[PDB]
Amino acid sequence: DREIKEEARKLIREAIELLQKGDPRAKEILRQAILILLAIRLLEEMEENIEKAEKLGNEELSELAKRAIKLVREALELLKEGDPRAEEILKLALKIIKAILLLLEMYENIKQAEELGDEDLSELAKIAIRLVRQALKLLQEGDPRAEEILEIALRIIKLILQLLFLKQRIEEQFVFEAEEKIRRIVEELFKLLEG
Amino acid sequence: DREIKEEARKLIREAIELLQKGDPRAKEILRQAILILLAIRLLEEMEENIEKAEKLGNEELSELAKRAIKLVREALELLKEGDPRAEEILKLALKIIKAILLLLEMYENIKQAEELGDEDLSELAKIAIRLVRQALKLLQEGDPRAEEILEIALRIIKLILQLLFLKQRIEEQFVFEAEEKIRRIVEELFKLLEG
Amino acid sequence: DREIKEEARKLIREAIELLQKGDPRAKEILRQAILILLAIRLLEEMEENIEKAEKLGNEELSELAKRAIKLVREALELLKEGDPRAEEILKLALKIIKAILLLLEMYENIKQAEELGDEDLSELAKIAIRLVRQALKLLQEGDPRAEEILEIALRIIKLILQLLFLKQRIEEQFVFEAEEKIRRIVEELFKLLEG
Amino acid sequence: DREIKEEARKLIREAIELLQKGDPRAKEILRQAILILLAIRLLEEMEENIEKAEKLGNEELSELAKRAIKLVREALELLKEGDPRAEEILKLALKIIKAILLLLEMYENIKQAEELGDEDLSELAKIAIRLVRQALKLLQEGDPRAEEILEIALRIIKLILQLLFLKQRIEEQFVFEAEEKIRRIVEELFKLLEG
């Protein structure tokens, strides 16, 4: 990754310190540089979240993490060469890793659900995890449906988290915000699924 | 209800574990499944809120709850078969139950107003309750005006709650946010009523 | 006012308990009733805010209050008869009274500024007060410019309050929100004044 | 500056106390007056923030401040005469000074990063500072790209601050809001850079 950080630093130097006197298009190079910086930070944190996953003891999430990591690094290596499709792939891969970290947070929360026995949330989260797996699989295959399924994965994950935070506040008007926002999430989810 | 939860689980299974290899339209089935899950949770909480209502000793709200419950369950049984109108009816019924739970919260608050003697809010709330009754009645009749009246019911209920929270703040700039949001609600209410 | 409250109650009764069996247009009457209720409450609070004004010892604000009160009551009496223009006039009068209460809050705050010697805010607030006076005068004349000037009055008042809250937080990132919202208010104010 | 404040007071007097009887266009003069008031306050605070900068011991920021101050004062003197381009130039100059104060806040925060050794943020901030320098330079030259570069300067600065506040939260769901907001900032930044 450090090599990638150095490549990013070179990109930023060319984009600004050199390119200020040159083509205004250098905004492209600047974009690539900042993108690489965000990606590097994201992977840096995710590699510790992998230790989290292993101590959380779910192999599905660990595989998700590892495949996503390799996806991102492959995308970075391709971007080092070019292939504008690398832009789309890198954005998608970062969104995926975002979703996987969010998944680990969700899973740690769902420990609470298991303690409660909210089997409804359990099955729903199972579908969510498998959905993310399907999105990762499609992305590995390059199917444009990667985004289409991923967005539904995200929306189900946010809904689940919303219900978990509502449950915790129940354990504690302070519940009104959730009763509202869950409705926007629900209707956006329906809008995506229905058309 | 549990049978309904099991039906929902079957729906999700067909929608994802099977349908991943098949028609992308499975988003429809997924939508139905998640919808059923939300509905089941909502009724589960509402059946306790019925005991709340009875201890609150208002028969109008109790009848509202019971008829809404039966509406929702009828809609679920229909959805088990099909009839795309089941989608509209189920959405409306859930919004209605939302409004009735909100009503119980409002009524418990309006206990404060009765202590104060805010007869203005009392009469206004009476109109709101009867409005909800009218919306439920129309929905029972299937008149498309169900949504039109229901939306006004909701907006009046939110306004009433806003004034109650303003009153509590008065018992307590911290009042500014209410002064703004009441204005937005008021002008949206007028926009609906006037056109 | 109490007679007006009773008239409002009659309006709501005709609008709902009677009108449910009749013309769906009853939303108009419902709107009028809710409007009258809001106005009643607003004047009820403002009459005590007049005592506030007199203890604050500014005759300009006191005259503003008295003329606005008479405006609102005249509009109510007109509405009792009809003349759809009463709708516009009543809305404007309520917004004006809102602005005058806001002014009293602003003046009490500006006591702090006088203690500080923020003569800039002092002169700006002078312009704001005179602007409100001009809007009230035009409204008394029925000039359509009443709204056009009033909106600028409001926006200057909000800006002034924003600077006062910023000053207090200065006495106290917790200042970032003001740095943003002042910018939005400023650019909206410019958009209104410039076109 | 005080002379400018007095000129602004004269502008407001002509715009309101005189102009109420005539040309509705006086909104222009009112706009100019309020604009001058904001500018004067801004410079008044920035001159102390210059002492901050010198105690912070960065000559780049000190030059930024001094050149921006002179820019603003030149623009004020021009606006005293006319040349509607003074409007654009003064708006840009104020946004620049805003960005420079924000920079000083960012730099004081980045003291934390230097303590941590977040060389990524360090290099990124270097690019941000040089970008602001470039925007100031172009503006001094009158190149219309002043705004185009400045906006990217601002967006990178906000992103950097967002990451610093996230880092502090890390030293402290409470992290969820940042994980959300950084995404909007990032995608807006990309939208600007990419088109």
mmCIF file with all atom_site columns, C-alpha atoms in Angstrom, chain C residues 118 120-121 123-124 127 130-131 134 145 148-149 152 156 159 163 166-167 170 173 175-176 179-180 182-183 186-187 189-190 192-194, chain D residues 9 12-13 16-17 20 22 24 27-28 30-31 34-35 37-38 41-42 45 87 91 94-95 98 101-102 105 109 158 161 165 168 181:
data_model
loop_
_atom_site.group_PDB
_atom_site.id
_atom_site.type_symbol
_atom_site.label_atom_id
_atom_site.label_alt_id
_atom_site.label_comp_id
_atom_site.label_asym_id
_atom_site.label_entity_id
_atom_site.label_seq_id
_atom_site.pdbx_PDB_ins_code
_atom_site.Cartn_x
_atom_site.Cartn_y
_atom_site.Cartn_z
_atom_site.occupancy
_atom_site.B_iso_or_equiv
_atom_site.pdbx_formal_charge
_atom_site.auth_seq_id
_atom_site.auth_comp_id
_atom_site.auth_asym_id
_atom_site.auth_atom_id
_atom_site.pdbx_PDB_model_num
ATOM 1  C CA . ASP C 1 118 ? -21.816 46.501 18.930 1.00 0.00 ? 118 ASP C CA 1
ATOM 2  C CA . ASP C 1 120 ? -22.949 47.942 13.944 1.00 0.00 ? 120 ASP C CA 1
ATOM 3  C CA . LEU C 1 121 ? -25.687 45.576 15.090 1.00 0.00 ? 121 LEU C CA 1
ATOM 4  C CA . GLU C 1 123 ? -27.728 50.546 13.535 1.00 0.00 ? 123 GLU C CA 1
ATOM 5  C CA . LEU C 1 124 ? -28.588 47.441 11.536 1.00 0.00 ? 124 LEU C CA 1
ATOM 6  C CA . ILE C 1 127 ? -32.959 49.671 10.004 1.00 0.00 ? 127 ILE C CA 1
ATOM 7  C CA . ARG C 1 130 ? -37.965 50.746 10.625 1.00 0.00 ? 130 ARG C CA 1
ATOM 8  C CA . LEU C 1 131 ? -38.303 48.210 7.828  1.00 0.00 ? 131 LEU C CA 1
ATOM 9  C CA . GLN C 1 134 ? -42.686 50.266 6.733  1.00 0.00 ? 134 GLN C CA 1
ATOM 10 C CA . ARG C 1 145 ? -45.173 45.515 -1.434 1.00 0.00 ? 145 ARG C CA 1
ATOM 11 C CA . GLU C 1 148 ? -41.850 42.172 -0.424 1.00 0.00 ? 148 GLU C CA 1
ATOM 12 C CA . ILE C 1 149 ? -40.532 44.427 2.329  1.00 0.00 ? 149 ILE C CA 1
ATOM 13 C CA . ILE C 1 152 ? -36.400 41.459 3.869  1.00 0.00 ? 152 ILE C CA 1
ATOM 14 C CA . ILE C 1 156 ? -32.313 40.886 8.353  1.00 0.00 ? 156 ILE C CA 1
ATOM 15 C CA . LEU C 1 159 ? -29.212 37.463 10.332 1.00 0.00 ? 159 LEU C CA 1
ATOM 16 C CA . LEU C 1 163 ? -24.758 37.139 14.796 1.00 0.00 ? 163 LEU C CA 1
ATOM 17 C CA . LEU C 1 166 ? -22.516 33.620 17.338 1.00 0.00 ? 166 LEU C CA 1
ATOM 18 C CA . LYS C 1 167 ? -21.416 36.316 19.781 1.00 0.00 ? 167 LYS C CA 1
ATOM 19 C CA . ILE C 1 170 ? -17.912 33.353 21.236 1.00 0.00 ? 170 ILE C CA 1
ATOM 20 C CA . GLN C 1 173 ? -16.688 22.667 16.153 1.00 0.00 ? 173 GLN C CA 1
ATOM 21 C CA . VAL C 1 175 ? -18.954 27.737 16.152 1.00 0.00 ? 175 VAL C CA 1
ATOM 22 C CA . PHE C 1 176 ? -18.878 25.993 12.755 1.00 0.00 ? 176 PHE C CA 1
ATOM 23 C CA . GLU C 1 179 ? -20.301 29.981 10.179 1.00 0.00 ? 179 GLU C CA 1
ATOM 24 C CA . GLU C 1 180 ? -22.303 27.851 7.724  1.00 0.00 ? 180 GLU C CA 1
ATOM 25 C CA . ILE C 1 182 ? -24.911 32.658 8.394  1.00 0.00 ? 182 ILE C CA 1
ATOM 26 C CA . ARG C 1 183 ? -23.520 32.054 4.916  1.00 0.00 ? 183 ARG C CA 1
ATOM 27 C CA . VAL C 1 186 ? -26.492 35.897 3.735  1.00 0.00 ? 186 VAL C CA 1
ATOM 28 C CA . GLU C 1 187 ? -26.638 34.475 0.230  1.00 0.00 ? 187 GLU C CA 1
ATOM 29 C CA . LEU C 1 189 ? -30.720 37.690 1.555  1.00 0.00 ? 189 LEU C CA 1
ATOM 30 C CA . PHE C 1 190 ? -28.515 38.765 -1.349 1.00 0.00 ? 190 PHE C CA 1
ATOM 31 C CA . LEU C 1 192 ? -33.711 38.465 -2.622 1.00 0.00 ? 192 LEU C CA 1
ATOM 32 C CA . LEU C 1 193 ? -32.227 41.954 -2.738 1.00 0.00 ? 193 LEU C CA 1
ATOM 33 C CA . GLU C 1 194 ? -30.304 41.555 -6.014 1.00 0.00 ? 194 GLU C CA 1
ATOM 34 C CA . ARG D 1 9   ? -24.016 53.716 7.582  1.00 0.00 ? 9   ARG D CA 1
ATOM 35 C CA . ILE D 1 12  ? -28.033 52.316 4.714  1.00 0.00 ? 12  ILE D CA 1
ATOM 36 C CA . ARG D 1 13  ? -29.510 55.704 5.590  1.00 0.00 ? 13  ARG D CA 1
ATOM 37 C CA . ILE D 1 16  ? -33.909 53.150 3.816  1.00 0.00 ? 16  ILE D CA 1
ATOM 38 C CA . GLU D 1 17  ? -34.741 56.398 5.582  1.00 0.00 ? 17  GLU D CA 1
ATOM 39 C CA . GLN D 1 20  ? -38.463 54.282 1.347  1.00 0.00 ? 20  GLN D CA 1
ATOM 40 C CA . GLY D 1 22  ? -38.983 56.191 -3.884 1.00 0.00 ? 22  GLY D CA 1
ATOM 41 C CA . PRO D 1 24  ? -37.755 50.184 -5.067 1.00 0.00 ? 24  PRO D CA 1
ATOM 42 C CA . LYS D 1 27  ? -32.595 47.133 -2.448 1.00 0.00 ? 27  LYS D CA 1
ATOM 43 C CA . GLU D 1 28  ? -29.310 47.428 -4.339 1.00 0.00 ? 28  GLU D CA 1
ATOM 44 C CA . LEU D 1 30  ? -29.307 48.061 1.040  1.00 0.00 ? 30  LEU D CA 1
ATOM 45 C CA . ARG D 1 31  ? -27.428 45.026 -0.259 1.00 0.00 ? 31  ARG D CA 1
ATOM 46 C CA . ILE D 1 34  ? -25.139 45.014 4.570  1.00 0.00 ? 34  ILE D CA 1
ATOM 47 C CA . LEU D 1 35  ? -22.310 43.579 2.488  1.00 0.00 ? 35  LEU D CA 1
ATOM 48 C CA . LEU D 1 37  ? -21.018 45.609 7.339  1.00 0.00 ? 37  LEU D CA 1
ATOM 49 C CA . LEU D 1 38  ? -20.268 41.899 7.050  1.00 0.00 ? 38  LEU D CA 1
ATOM 50 C CA . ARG D 1 41  ? -16.702 42.591 10.849 1.00 0.00 ? 41  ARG D CA 1
ATOM 51 C CA . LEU D 1 42  ? -14.820 39.886 8.973  1.00 0.00 ? 42  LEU D CA 1
ATOM 52 C CA . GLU D 1 45  ? -11.726 39.463 13.387 1.00 0.00 ? 45  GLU D CA 1
ATOM 53 C CA . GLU D 1 87  ? -19.559 43.126 -6.488 1.00 0.00 ? 87  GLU D CA 1
ATOM 54 C CA . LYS D 1 91  ? -17.784 38.426 -2.799 1.00 0.00 ? 91  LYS D CA 1
ATOM 55 C CA . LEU D 1 94  ? -14.740 37.541 1.391  1.00 0.00 ? 94  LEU D CA 1
ATOM 56 C CA . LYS D 1 95  ? -14.976 33.874 0.478  1.00 0.00 ? 95  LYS D CA 1
ATOM 57 C CA . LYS D 1 98  ? -13.319 32.849 5.024  1.00 0.00 ? 98  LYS D CA 1
ATOM 58 C CA . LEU D 1 101 ? -9.567  31.748 8.655  1.00 0.00 ? 101 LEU D CA 1
ATOM 59 C CA . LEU D 1 102 ? -10.773 28.203 8.093  1.00 0.00 ? 102 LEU D CA 1
ATOM 60 C CA . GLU D 1 105 ? -8.393  26.589 12.303 1.00 0.00 ? 105 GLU D CA 1
ATOM 61 C CA . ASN D 1 109 ? -6.067  21.093 14.255 1.00 0.00 ? 109 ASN D CA 1
ATOM 62 C CA . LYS D 1 158 ? -13.656 20.691 4.497  1.00 0.00 ? 158 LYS D CA 1
ATOM 63 C CA . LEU D 1 161 ? -11.373 18.900 8.668  1.00 0.00 ? 161 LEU D CA 1
ATOM 64 C CA . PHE D 1 165 ? -12.910 15.388 13.524 1.00 0.00 ? 165 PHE D CA 1
ATOM 65 C CA . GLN D 1 168 ? -10.814 12.951 17.339 1.00 0.00 ? 168 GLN D CA 1
ATOM 66 C CA . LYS D 1 181 ? -21.178 13.142 5.676  1.00 0.00 ? 181 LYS D CA 1
#
